[PDB]
Amino acid sequence: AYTNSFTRGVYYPDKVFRSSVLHSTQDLFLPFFSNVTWFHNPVLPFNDGVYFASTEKSNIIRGWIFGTTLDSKTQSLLIVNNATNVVIKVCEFQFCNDPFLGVNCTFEYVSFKNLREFVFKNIDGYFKIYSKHTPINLVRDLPQGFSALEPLVDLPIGINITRFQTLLAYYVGYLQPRTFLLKYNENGTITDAVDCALDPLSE
Amino acid sequence: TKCTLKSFTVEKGIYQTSNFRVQPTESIVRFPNITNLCPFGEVFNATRFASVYAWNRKRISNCVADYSVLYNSASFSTFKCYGVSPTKLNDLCFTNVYADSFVIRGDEVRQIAPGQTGKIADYNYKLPDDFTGCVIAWNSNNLDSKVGGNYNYLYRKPFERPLQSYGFQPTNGVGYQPYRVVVLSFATVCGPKKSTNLVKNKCVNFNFNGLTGTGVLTESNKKFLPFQQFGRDIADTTDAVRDPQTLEILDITPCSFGGVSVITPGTNTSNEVAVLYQGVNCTEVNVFQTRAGCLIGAEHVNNSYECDIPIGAGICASYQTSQSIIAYTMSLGAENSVAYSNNSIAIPTNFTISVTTEILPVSMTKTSVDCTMYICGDSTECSNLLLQYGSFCTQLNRALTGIAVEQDKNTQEVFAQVKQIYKTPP
Amino acid sequence: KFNGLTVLPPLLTDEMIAQYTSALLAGTITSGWTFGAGAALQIPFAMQMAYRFNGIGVTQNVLYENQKLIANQFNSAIGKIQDSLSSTASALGKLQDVVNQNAQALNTLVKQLSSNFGAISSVLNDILSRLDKVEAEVQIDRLITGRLQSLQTYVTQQLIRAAEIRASANLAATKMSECVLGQSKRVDFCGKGYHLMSFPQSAPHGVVFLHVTYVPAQEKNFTTAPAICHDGKAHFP
Amino acid sequence: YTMSLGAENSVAYSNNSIAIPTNFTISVTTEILPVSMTKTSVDCTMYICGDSTECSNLLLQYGSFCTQLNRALTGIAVEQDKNTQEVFAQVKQIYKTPPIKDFGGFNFSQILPDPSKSKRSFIEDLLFNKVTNGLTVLPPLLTDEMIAQYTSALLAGTITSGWTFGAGAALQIPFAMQMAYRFNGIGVTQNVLYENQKLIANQFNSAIGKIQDSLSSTASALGKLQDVVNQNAQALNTLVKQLSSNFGAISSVLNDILSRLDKVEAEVQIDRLITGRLQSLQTYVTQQLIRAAEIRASANLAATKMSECVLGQSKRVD
Ligand SMILES: *[C@@H]1O[C@H](CO)[C@@H](O[C@@H]2O[C@H](CO)[C@@H](O)[C@H](O)[C@H]2NC(C)=O)[C@H](O)[C@H]1NC(C)=O
Ligand SMILES: *[C@@H]1O[C@H](CO)[C@@H](O[C@@H]2O[C@H](CO)[C@@H](O)[C@H](O)[C@H]2NC(C)=O)[C@H](O)[C@H]1NC(C)=O
Ligand SMILES: *[C@@H]1O[C@H](CO)[C@@H](O)[C@H](O)[C@H]1NC(C)=O
Ligand SMILES: *[C@@H]1O[C@H](CO)[C@@H](O)[C@H](O)[C@H]1NC(C)=O
Ligand SMILES: *[C@@H]1O[C@H](CO)[C@@H](O)[C@H](O)[C@H]1NC(C)=O
Ligand SMILES: *[C@@H]1O[C@H](CO)[C@@H](O)[C@H](O)[C@H]1NC(C)=O
Ligand SMILES: *[C@@H]1O[C@H](CO)[C@@H](O)[C@H](O)[C@H]1NC(C)=O
Ligand SMILES: *[C@@H]1O[C@H](CO)[C@@H](O)[C@H](O)[C@H]1NC(C)=O
Ligand SMILES: *[C@@H]1O[C@H](CO)[C@@H](O)[C@H](O)[C@H]1NC(C)=O
Ligand SMILES: *[C@@H]1O[C@H](CO)[C@@H](O)[C@H](O)[C@H]1NC(C)=O
Ligand SMILES: *[C@@H]1O[C@H](CO)[C@@H](O)[C@H](O)[C@H]1NC(C)=O
Ligand SMILES: *[C@@H]1O[C@H](CO)[C@@H](O)[C@H](O)[C@H]1NC(C)=O
Ligand SMILES: *[C@@H]1O[C@H](CO)[C@@H](O)[C@H](O)[C@H]1NC(C)=O
C-alpha cells in the first residue's frame, strides 16, 4: 500500500549556518511528490537511504533494526527508544527474525498527538540520523507542509547496512541523489526547498 | 615605485607598488573539552595477566591514545614500535586497535611485544611481525610471580596459545625475573589535540575543529542551530564559527589588506612622496583618514583646487606651498549665481575667435608575431610538439593579420575622404 | 627583441598623409564645404567666413565690418597653438599613450620568454641539450603551454585595443567629414564655442584638428520683452 | 502565436492632400545610460595563493601574469573616472539658480536640488532608491554628492541661460524667451509659444509629474543601470566560487594539499590549482575589459548627448 511525500523529507545537508540566502546542494534526498509505502511489520531494503515517518503519542513503535541478515552472521544496529532513554548496540544479535512486544558487538550508545519523522543514510563508513517532531491536525497521511529534519547521531560504525525493520501508522520513502535549492531564512533555518528535477519550473 | 616601474625616473602620478596585509599575531587552536582517553591503566596496571605462552587482549579503539605521556609514565620501564615512530604516540591514530598482553620470566616476557625475540613471541606472546603500532613493558614482581617461579606465567599464533611454566619469581635471577608487557597494535584511537586561549580582536591565524584560516575574531549576534559549527558568506567564504569549548558564535573577518599606492610629483621635481593604503583604517598601519583609506606623508588642506593627482572619494593631492605634498577635497569649479530674472537678458557686444587643438589616435603599430618562431626557437623537436595543439598558431597569426590590415583602413577612412589632391594658389 | 616579433610599415607613409592633410586644408581654404559636396568651387576667403558666420546666426556684416580684427585674432590664436605645442609634449598624451601601451605589451611578451612556467629552464636549448626526447618532451610541453597562453593573452589584449582604436578612428573620420568638410551645428562636438571650421594636421599614429570657433566675449545686461504692443496688435522680432 | 509588428495604417496620401497639426503635446521622455562600472582591483598573489609561501614561490615561475593582470584592471579602473568626467564635467563653473522661481509658469522644482534631501533633486532620489578576499573595490573619484553638483550646474545653466553657457559665459535670458528660441529651432514660429504659454507650462509641469509615477510604479524602466550592477556582482561571485574548484588536484583547500602530501607531490598538485585559478582570473579580466569597452561606448554616447542634447538643441531626428 502507498501514499505520497508531497513537500516533506528535506533535512539539513551539512553542519553549516547560512542565513537570509538561497543555497544549492546535491545529496541523497527524498524526491518531492514521490510515492511512499504505508504500514501499521515486514523487513525492507535500505536502498541508498531511508525516509521514515510515523504518527505517534505513546511509543507504539519501539525502534528499529538495521543491518543485512538482522540475525547472527554479521553486525547490526539495534536501535530502541525506552521511555527516558534512547539506546543503541551493534552486535550480530541472535534474536528472532522479527522481535516484538505487546501493550560483532564493537559499539553501543545511550541518549495522534504528533508526527515523528526521520532520515537514515550510511556513507563512507558513517551512519547518520536526522529527525523532527511536529504536532498535527491530520493522521491519515503525511500532511502537505514543510519542516527540515535535523541531525541527532553521526557515527563511524563501518558496517555495510543494506536492510532494516521496524520494532513494534507509519510510512517509508527512499532517498535519491538530487540537486536541491534551499531557502535559509534570517534565523539560519531551512524554510523552503526546490528539487531541480521535479518539473521545468523547478529547473 | 622605481622598482615597480623598472625606471630610475618617475613622472607625476599615483602608482600602486605593493599590497599591505596585517600579519597574524599568533596561531589559535580550538577543539572540544577533552574526553574518552584510552584506559592504559587497564593495560599496564592490570589486576591479572596471561602467560607469554597464552597472550590475552583488550580493545584500544574509539578512545583517545595519550600514549606519549603513558610511555614516559611509571606504567612501563621500556617500549618499542613495529610500524611507527615512538615519539608519534602524542597524536598517532588507527581506525581500530587492541592491546595484546602477557607476563613471564623476563626472557619469555619480552615476547609480549610486536614481532619480539624468542620463538614464544611468534608462537603466542607477540603481535605479528608485520603489525603496526607499539608495545611497552615493566617488572612484574608486584603480582606476576611466585617464590619457585609462578606456574601462571609460561612460554612455548600471535596473541594466542608445547609450553611450560616460567621462572618468574621474587628470588629469580636476571633472565628468570618476573616481567610483563603489552602490544597496542593498530580513524578512532587518536592521541589528544591541544588548544589555546581564544584571543579576539587581534589578527590571528586559527584552527577550529579542523578548519583553518587567518582573520579577526569578534563576538557576534548570529543564531546558529546547535549542531551547526561554521557560518558561510553568500559565496563559500567562512564568516562565523562556534567555539567548541564555549558554544557562543564569533564572526570572522579577513585581516585588513589593500594596495600600497605612492602619490608622487615627478622625480624631475622632488623626492618627497605620500602613501595611500587603500581601504584600510589608519589604526591598522601627517596622517589623514580619507574615504579612500589611510593616507600618510601628506598635509590635509582646507582650500580646494583642480584635481592634480587623484586619490578617490573626492580627495586629490599635489606638491605645493618651501613646498610639500598636500591633500584636499577637489574643487568642481568656481560657483556662479546667474543673474536671471523674468525680464533681464545679457547680449554679447564683442567676440573672440578661439582656436582649440583636439587630438585623436588612428592606428596602432602594425605588428605580426610568427607564433611558431616565438614558441619554438628554431627547434624541430619543439615544432613537432606544437602541432599537437592544432590550429592555435594559424588562428593567432590570422587574428593579428586582421588587426594589421585594419590600421591601413583606419588611416584610409580618416584621411582619404578627398577624391583629388587639391593644391593652393601660390 | 626579434624572436618572431615583427613590425610592418603602414600602407600610407607620413609623406602621403601630409599630402592628404594638405589637400583637405587647401580645399577647406579655397572652396569652403563645396569640395566635400562635389567639385571644389572657389570662393574668396572673407566671403567663406561670411557664410560661416551666417551659419551661427551672426549676420554677415558683423564679419566684414570687423575683418581686420577677426584676422588678427585668428593669426594670433594660431601662434598660441605653436607656443602651446612647443612648451610641453604632455599635450599629445592621447598619441604617446598608444605608442607606450604597444611598447609595454611587446616588452611583456618578450620578457615572458624568460619565464620557466615550471620547466627546468626557459632557455629551450638547455632542455634539448640536457635531456633524452622522452624526458625533454615533458619539459617542453610546459614551455609550449606557458608561451602559448602568454601569446593568446597578448593577442586578446591587442584585439580589444584595436577595437578601442577603431572607435577613435570612426570618431576621427566623423570629425573630418562634418567638422572639416562642413560646419557641424552639433554643440561642443567641434570644440567649445559656436563652430566655424577646422583644419586637420597629421601626427604620428593620429590626427590633430585645429577647431576654429566663435566664442562671445564682452556682454551687457538689458531690459527685454517677448513682444511689443503698437495699435493693440502685438509685434514679434 | 505569430507576432504582429504593429497596427496597420494606410496613409491617406494623394497628389493635392496635406495634413497639418492644429495642436501639440509637449512630452517628457526618460532616457537612461550606464557611465561607469564598479572600479575593481585584484591582488592576484593573494587570490591564487592563500598566504602559502610554497604556492607564492611557485607562482613566480609564471613571470609577468600577476603584473599585467593588475595593470589591465588598473587601466579599466582609471577609465571609469575618465568616463564620469567626460559625461558630467562639461561646464566651467558651478552655476546656481536664483531663490525665486519666475520661470514663466514652468516648474523645475522636482528636478532641481533640495538641500534637505545628500543635496539631490527629488527625481534623483527616486533613481538612487530604485537601483540596488584578494579582490577589492575602489571608490569613484567623484562622489554622488559631487555628481549632484555637476547635474545641478548643467541644469541651472540650461534653465537660466539657454545653450549659451555651452558656447561661452552663461548669458541670462528669461525662460519664456528661451522657449521662443527652442520653438524657432523646430520651425514652429515663436508667437505659437506666447499665444499658448499657460497651456505649454501645464503640459510640461504635468509631464514632469508623470516621470515620478513612472519611475515609482516599476523598476523595469531603470533596467540598464541595475543590470550593470548585477553583471559585476555575478562576475565577482563567479571569481570567488572558482576558488573552491579542484582543477584535478586532491583538494582546493590549499593547506590540505601541503599538510597531506610529500613536497614533490604537493608541488605537482599545487601547480594545477595555480593553473586553474590563474586561467579563471585571466577569464574574469578579459570579461571586464570587454564589459568596460561596452560601458565606454555608452559613456561616449552619454557625453555626446550631454553636449548636444543638454548644452544645445540637436536637430538629429530621434
Ligand atoms: C490643444 O490641446 C490641449 C490639450 O493638450 C487643449 O487643452 C484642454 O482643453 C480642454 C477644453 O477643450 C480643457 O478642459 C483641458 O483642461 C485642457 N487641457 C490642458 C492640459 O490645459 C486645448 O484646448 C487644445 N487647443 C486647441 C486650439 O485645440
Ligand atoms: C511645483 O510643483 C510641485 C509639485 O510637483 C508643487 O509642490 C506641491 O505644492 C502643494 C501646494 O504648496 C503642496 O500641498 C504639496 O505638498 C507640494 N508637493 C511637494 C512634493 O512639495 C509646488 O508647489 C510647485 N511650485 C510652483 C512654484 O509652482
Ligand atoms: C505513484 O504516483 C502516481 C501520481 O504521481 C499515482 O497515480 C500512483 O497511484 C502512485 N503509485 C504507487 C504505487 O504509489
Ligand atoms: C532502557 O534500556 C536499557 C537496556 O537496553 C536499560 O539499561 C535502561 O535502564 C532503560 N531505560 C529506561 C528509562 O527504561
Ligand atoms: C562476537 O564474536 C565472538 C567470537 O569472536 C562470538 O563468541 C560472539 O558470539 C559474537 N557475538 C554475537 C552477538 O554472536
Ligand atoms: C563493506 O563493503 C566493502 C565494499 O563495498 C568491503 O570492502 C568491506 O570489506 C565491507 N566491510 C564489512 C565490515 O563487511
Ligand atoms: C527569529 O528569531 C526571533 C527570536 O530569537 C524571533 O522573534 C523572530 O520572529 C525570528 N524571525 C524569523 C524571520 O524567523
Ligand atoms: C569546558 O570546561 C570548562 C571548565 O573547565 C567549562 O567552563 C565549559 O563550559 C566546558 N565546555 C563544554 C562545551 O563542556
Ligand atoms: C627636469 O630637471 C632638469 C634638471 O635636472 C631641468 O633642467 C628641467 O627643466 C626639468 N624639467 C621639467 C619638465 O621639470
Ligand atoms: C576606523 O575608521 C574610522 C574613521 O574612518 C574611525 O572612527 C574608527 O575609530 C576606526 N576604527 C578603529 C578600530 O580604529
Ligand atoms: C580647517 O579649518 C577649520 C576652521 O574653518 C579649522 O578648525 C581646522 O583646524 C582646519 N584644518 C586643519 C587640518 O587644521
Ligand atoms: C573687441 O575685442 C578686441 C580684442 O579681442 C578689442 O581690440 C576691440 O577693441 C573690441 N571691440 C569692441 C567694440 O569692444
Ligand atoms: C548684470 O546686472 C546684475 C545686477 O542686476 C549684475 O550682478 C551683473 O554682474 C551684471 N552683468 C554684467 C555683464 O554687467
GROMACS .gro file of C-alpha atoms in nm, chain B residues 1-128:
model
  128
  204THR     CA    1   5.800   5.274  -0.706
  205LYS     CA    2   6.123   5.293  -0.913
  206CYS     CA    3   6.149   4.912  -0.897
  207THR     CA    4   5.773   4.862  -0.964
  208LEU     CA    5   5.803   5.073  -1.283
  209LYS     CA    6   6.156   4.938  -1.372
  210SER     CA    7   6.277   5.303  -1.401
  211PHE     CA    8   6.513   5.549  -1.224
  212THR     CA    9   6.282   5.845  -1.320
  213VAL     CA   10   5.912   5.854  -1.217
  214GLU     CA   11   5.663   6.105  -1.368
  215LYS     CA   12   5.391   6.278  -1.156
  216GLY     CA   13   5.108   6.039  -1.057
  217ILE     CA   14   4.967   5.773  -0.825
  218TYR     CA   15   5.127   5.427  -0.860
  219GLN     CA   16   5.024   5.102  -0.690
  220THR     CA   17   5.351   4.930  -0.579
  221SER     CA   18   5.264   4.653  -0.330
  222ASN     CA   19   4.986   4.503  -0.116
  223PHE     CA   20   4.975   4.580   0.257
  224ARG     CA   21   4.845   4.291   0.472
  225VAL     CA   22   4.808   4.290   0.852
  226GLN     CA   23   5.010   3.990   0.977
  227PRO     CA   24   4.870   3.709   1.200
  228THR     CA   25   4.991   3.798   1.553
  229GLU     CA   26   4.975   3.429   1.664
  230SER     CA   27   4.807   3.090   1.598
  231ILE     CA   28   4.488   2.994   1.789
  232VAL     CA   29   4.371   2.631   1.814
  233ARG     CA   30   4.027   2.522   1.943
  234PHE     CA   31   3.887   2.170   1.992
  235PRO     CA   32   3.621   2.046   2.243
  236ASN     CA   33   3.681   1.981   2.616
  237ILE     CA   34   3.890   1.657   2.604
  238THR     CA   35   3.714   1.322   2.676
  239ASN     CA   36   3.723   0.940   2.630
  240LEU     CA   37   4.104   0.896   2.674
  241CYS     CA   38   4.232   0.535   2.636
  242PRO     CA   39   4.229   0.317   2.959
  243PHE     CA   40   4.609   0.245   2.956
  244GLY     CA   41   4.593   0.178   3.336
  245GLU     CA   42   4.377  -0.128   3.247
  246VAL     CA   43   4.660  -0.242   3.009
  247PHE     CA   44   4.980  -0.179   3.210
  248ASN     CA   45   4.850  -0.184   3.575
  249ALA     CA   46   4.609  -0.481   3.517
  250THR     CA   47   4.487  -0.694   3.814
  251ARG     CA   48   4.597  -1.017   3.633
  252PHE     CA   49   4.798  -1.118   3.321
  253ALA     CA   50   4.809  -1.426   3.093
  254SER     CA   51   5.132  -1.623   3.026
  255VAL     CA   52   5.362  -1.522   2.734
  256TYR     CA   53   5.269  -1.873   2.601
  257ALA     CA   54   4.898  -1.763   2.605
  258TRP     CA   55   4.882  -1.380   2.550
  259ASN     CA   56   4.544  -1.210   2.618
  260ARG     CA   57   4.399  -0.893   2.454
  261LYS     CA   58   4.164  -0.593   2.509
  262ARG     CA   59   4.017  -0.306   2.297
  263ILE     CA   60   4.221   0.012   2.220
  264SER     CA   61   3.992   0.194   1.969
  265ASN     CA   62   3.724   0.471   1.969
  266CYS     CA   63   3.923   0.614   2.269
  267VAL     CA   64   4.199   0.880   2.256
  268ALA     CA   65   4.553   0.731   2.293
  269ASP     CA   66   4.752   0.978   2.515
  270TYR     CA   67   5.039   0.724   2.471
  271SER     CA   68   5.333   0.975   2.471
  272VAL     CA   69   5.255   1.054   2.839
  273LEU     CA   70   5.192   0.681   2.916
  274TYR     CA   71   5.535   0.581   2.767
  275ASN     CA   72   5.719   0.830   2.996
  276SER     CA   73   5.494   0.745   3.299
  277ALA     CA   74   5.551   0.473   3.566
  278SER     CA   75   5.336   0.214   3.371
  279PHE     CA   76   5.642   0.099   3.164
  280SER     CA   77   6.020   0.064   3.217
  281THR     CA   78   6.074   0.005   2.838
  282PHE     CA   79   5.896   0.046   2.499
  283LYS     CA   80   5.929  -0.030   2.123
  284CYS     CA   81   5.740   0.005   1.787
  285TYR     CA   82   5.675  -0.235   1.493
  286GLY     CA   83   5.544   0.019   1.233
  287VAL     CA   84   5.559   0.374   1.385
  288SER     CA   85   5.787   0.635   1.548
  289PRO     CA   86   5.779   0.608   1.936
  290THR     CA   87   5.753   0.992   1.964
  291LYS     CA   88   5.431   0.985   1.749
  292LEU     CA   89   5.229   0.845   2.048
  293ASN     CA   90   5.113   1.202   2.141
  294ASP     CA   91   4.895   1.227   1.822
  295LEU     CA   92   4.904   0.890   1.629
  296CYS     CA   93   4.579   0.709   1.534
  297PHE     CA   94   4.411   0.400   1.379
  298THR     CA   95   4.052   0.314   1.272
  299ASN     CA   96   4.075   0.016   1.514
  300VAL     CA   97   4.339  -0.113   1.763
  301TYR     CA   98   4.389  -0.357   2.054
  302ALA     CA   99   4.630  -0.409   2.348
  303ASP     CA  100   4.758  -0.771   2.346
  304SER     CA  101   4.921  -0.854   2.688
  305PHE     CA  102   5.121  -1.116   2.885
  306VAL     CA  103   5.366  -1.183   3.175
  307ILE     CA  104   5.653  -1.433   3.233
  308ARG     CA  105   6.021  -1.473   3.329
  309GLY     CA  106   6.190  -1.173   3.155
  310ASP     CA  107   6.348  -1.369   2.863
  311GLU     CA  108   5.998  -1.504   2.769
  312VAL     CA  109   5.808  -1.192   2.898
  313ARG     CA  110   5.996  -0.978   2.637
  314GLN     CA  111   5.787  -1.175   2.378
  315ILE     CA  112   5.475  -0.966   2.477
  316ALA     CA  113   5.562  -0.707   2.201
  317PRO     CA  114   5.502  -0.697   1.817
  318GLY     CA  115   5.750  -0.932   1.637
  319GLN     CA  116   5.955  -0.971   1.963
  320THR     CA  117   6.256  -1.203   2.025
  321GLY     CA  118   6.236  -1.580   2.105
  322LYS     CA  119   6.007  -1.844   1.943
  323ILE     CA  120   5.736  -1.792   2.212
  324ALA     CA  121   5.669  -1.442   2.062
  325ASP     CA  122   5.551  -1.566   1.717
  326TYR     CA  123   5.403  -1.885   1.874
  327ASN     CA  124   5.189  -1.697   2.136
  328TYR     CA  125   5.303  -1.376   2.312
  329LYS     CA  126   5.362  -1.117   2.037
  330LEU     CA  127   5.156  -0.924   1.789
  331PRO     CA  128   5.250  -1.030   1.427
   0.00000   0.00000   0.00000
